[PDB]
Amino acid sequence: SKKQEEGLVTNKYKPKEPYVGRCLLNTRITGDQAPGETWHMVFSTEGEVPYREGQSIGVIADGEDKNGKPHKLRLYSIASSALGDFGDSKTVSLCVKRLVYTNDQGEVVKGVCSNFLCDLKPGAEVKITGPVGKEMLMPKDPNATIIMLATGTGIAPFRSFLWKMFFEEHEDYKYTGLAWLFLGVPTSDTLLYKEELEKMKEMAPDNFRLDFAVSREQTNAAGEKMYIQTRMAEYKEELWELLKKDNTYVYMCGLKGMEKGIDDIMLDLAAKDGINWLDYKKQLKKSEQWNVEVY
Template sequence: MATPATQRSRHVPVHFPLKLVSRRMLAPTVGHYTFVRDDGQPLDFIPGQFIQVHFRYADGTPTKRSYSLATIHDHALGPGEAVEIAVSYVPGGAATALFEGLKEGDAIEASGPYGRFCLMPGDANRRYLLIATGTGVTPYRSMLPQLETLMRERGVEVVLLFGARTPAELLYGGEFRAFAERHPQFRFVPCFSRQMPDAPHPDDRHGYVQQFLAEFAPDAAGDIAYLCGNPNMVDACFEALKGCGLPVPHIRREKYVSSK
């Protein structure tokens, strides 16, 4: 098995055109976009990485936005063709205008893959604590095939704590719940800060993700945690996990900051 450094060396960032294949709404203000590379090449990447979309402001100034890849594919079968991302709409945002204006068949410029927010082949942990808010959950969707392999081969357990304000904003919630029902070692725990579902699942919680960390008894000897999403959540969970004794290298972080 390749080391992380070897894996990253095979995924050198490149620039490429993306053609929109389809889009659907995941939530009132979040769209799921499916692209293919318009140069006919696949995008080989490590789940957890992101791409950058390049465009220009109205005055011609170049800019870019970063989006974690939500694409699910099995690396044992080779890289897939789809390039999937979740896009949060920000009122008045230049990137929002770009994405809302896209029609099927339209092309945009992108580069990547980038980032090291990935599962590491050398990990020997007993459990992963995956914690997210909003579109910060997209890397974990991409990781599902890897997690399935790790559960089967190493017997790891996985807890996904996912914070959303309402059931309508629980991105990919149906997919994660279905995955949990197929895999007893995977537990999906949605945390709703404003509104609970009409018929809550036993694993649904009312509050913020950081309020429920203690329920899962973070273990310095056996856990590795991933934190992705709102910076305040990431900081709060980072301090809580350090307080439980987790070493800093076992608390892997990626903060999402909305840009117009």
């Protein structure tokens, strides 16, 4: 594999007997004017949960379902690097969007686990399972060009990636490649980790490119809404050229459906080059250079 799979751990903890951590910090990272709430929370793990960049953990909300059984676990991409927000390898962090919407019947639907997580106060316990997954593991190549495409909470695994790449010192992993993050959100009030990301850009100016796409507030020169694919289109020649290099790895995380718009601009780019994007994407997936985790 071309990914950091060495010593990988999956499901050390299962629903039947999860790890019980404690909330150390819970902070809303979206503005007051934001239409929806997203929270950044840090749980203690005592160094018992051996997760790595790109993995997820399952969370079992407190309470019971309509049948008296414990709630089914919900997966959340880990937003912290392996060393964690405190650099001590004894915590794990999540980036959670509170799911609340009204169906066509006028009935409010409050997501069970997302609201449970966002309502957590420091000191409160949390049932955790995992670590989970291997689709979004980082490339082994320390000079890899890493293109990260995210929408909303999809930023989570890339915050994890970026912490290891730019906020930490690893004698065995000194990142020298080009990291490029595209983050699409509806309003600037929902620009998750804006400060952190701009700080990374400040300390690694030539190695980190950061492009925000705020669809409801920005438009390109033509006046078109700035969706993630719209922002990508501002760099079409560069991106296509990079997609042809063997050390280029593309990761996509976030709302299912963000894939279509991205494929549309890729279809155009490849075609102009006499290439069928649908086929090329299959090849990139097989060569581990196109990794997707949408929900």
